[PDB]
Design a protein around this ligand. Sequence first.
Ligand SMILES: O=C(O)c1ccccc1Nc1ccc(OCCCCP(=O)(O)O)cc1C(=O)O
Ligand SMILES: O=C(O)c1ccccc1Nc1ccc(OCCCCP(=O)(O)O)cc1C(=O)O
Lengths: 325, 328
Amino acid sequence: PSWPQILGRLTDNRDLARGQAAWAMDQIMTGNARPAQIAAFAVAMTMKAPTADEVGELAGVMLSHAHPLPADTVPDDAVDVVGTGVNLSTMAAIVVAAAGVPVVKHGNRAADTLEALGVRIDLGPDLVARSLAEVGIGFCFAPRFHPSYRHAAAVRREIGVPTVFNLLGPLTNPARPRAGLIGCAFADLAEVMAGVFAARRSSVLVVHGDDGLDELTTTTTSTIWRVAAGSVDKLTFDPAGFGFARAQLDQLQANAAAVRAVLGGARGPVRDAVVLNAAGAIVAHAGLSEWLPAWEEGLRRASAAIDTGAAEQLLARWVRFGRQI
Amino acid sequence: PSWPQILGRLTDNRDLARGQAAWAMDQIMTGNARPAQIAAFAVAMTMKAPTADEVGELAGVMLSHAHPLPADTVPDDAVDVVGTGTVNLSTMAAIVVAAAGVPVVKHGNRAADTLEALGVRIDLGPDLVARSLAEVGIGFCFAPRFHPSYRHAAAVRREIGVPTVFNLLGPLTNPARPRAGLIGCAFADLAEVMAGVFAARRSSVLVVHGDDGLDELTTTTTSTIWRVAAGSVDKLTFDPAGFGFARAQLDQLGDAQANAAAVRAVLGGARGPVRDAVVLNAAGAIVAHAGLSEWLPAWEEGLRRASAAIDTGAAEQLLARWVRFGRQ
Ligand SMILES: O=C(O)c1ccccc1Nc1ccc(OCCCCP(=O)(O)O)cc1C(=O)O
Ligand SMILES: O=C(O)c1ccccc1Nc1ccc(OCCCCP(=O)(O)O)cc1C(=O)O
């Protein structure tokens, strides 16, 4: 295999042969790729239109190089709550964890929201494991678990344009949770991302707000690719069906204040959006083992996690956990 | 403008707005583009099939930055003989055309190697290329010497390896700006684009693509010719069998050392498929030359002039004189 071979195939608008995407990603992560080669690959794959097989190979290589969490430290039913791209997902994650569903998130700075809240984001595998056990939630700092991806990440920022690489974050949570609510801002790639989760037998709702959000929106309908039993089912979701009023898009350090307000019981469109996304994660969680009863239960659990103060308390306990390390 | 804007537009499979390709090329040519940005643009512009307007803007920026030849040193009827990539055929055809009395000014880069092997000094500044054109009847613009700020793009092209839109610009960024030529293109889809760019400049060009894939007029089969003249483009099918040329095989048409030997053989009068191809392509450039000011009569004359340039020894002498020039 070679870069001219692989780049040539892509520029010819052909799908890659089995293993080729993997070879490319492994070159990129073993420091064997020039920035120009990385950029050419990211762009060419994007314009060719990536397959789930291809994106799967990319994510597979990344996870093969990643620092794992220690053995038997991630519950079988842990979930992620995240988008391709953060205020809504951070809150939803806390609420989901507070409802009793273990959450392990994965991210990087532009993570900023959590720091502003007093959470310690840069922990190693053993301490993330302890956080997950003792608090019910953990955060994997992406640079710390994916050191070899730094070359790729640098090129991402240099070219600016979105590419297939924008999918890899949610697909390479180093804790490897089997479930989640996953936002995707790119309607065409959402389906591909869903296929990758399907191949892994994950239980995920891949969500794309029809207003463009990488979260379940309250301003209008959302497209959901429901992934369960290795298959993908495409659905349109209307929050009005669960009694939610339509919000305006503009209503959705600043984030930290917003987090404190919602967890404190503030009513409004932000809370509604948090509750909706938290419920989505809980439905995805239920999928590891009916759509309407599942959503109704998810919504009850999410609302109760806030209203009882459990979500607010969990964040406080999370903050305290880090200050005691 | 900005890279996110232009690259986003290209990845969305949209043609660029007026000026955007120019802006991009200019960033690249002023050392203001990161290698990753250069590469992303090269690939995106390639996979979003480039338009004549866009390719014209790229070449235009390149020429706006290039060292020109001194005023009035390039004859109004000078021609180019070149392919996008057959360096053996175009090199020989170029010498033959010059020997027939049509000024030739070429533009090229090392992978030029064949000419050096023949003892020609290829790396000359504008003033000496001009002198070469006047005194010998042929000149060569060595690309790094005229396009110095292209070096960042050059490095990126080596790194990614695959052909891109940048592979199309060579015939369109000749710093001597000849107004006529025989221009080969290996990709038929882009040949029509190249013809469009030449038409915009009102060049008299034959853009040629062998139906066997050669970036020359072939003798193995027919060729497609985009005939550019009067700012308008006519697309034609061309069969050299109509001029009595025997069919050759693709294998009959090497490194710079071998190419030089082949050059010496042809200019020395060796008959065969290689000579035929040279004569045919030399004739084509002569036909393009005539178009600056009737199709079959033009070809018949072009073929007579090319054959005679070889057979009298004029072509062989011109090369000897070209080599002599560099040493004096
Ligand atoms: O930004 C991304 O696209 C990304 C996606 C998945 C995982 C990580 C990502 N980013 C990075 C990964 C590594 C990295 O660089 C690692 C530095 C850590 C050094 P050490 O080996 O000592 O832990 C930087 C980034 C980044 O976003 O800037
Ligand atoms: O490669 C370098 O980094 C370099 C360094 C110093 C001086 C020249 C350099 N390279 C070039 C600079 C300009 C240039 O200009 C080429 C323009 C024409 C391209 P084409 O013949 O393919 O149409 C080509 C090169 C090169 O190394 O290839």
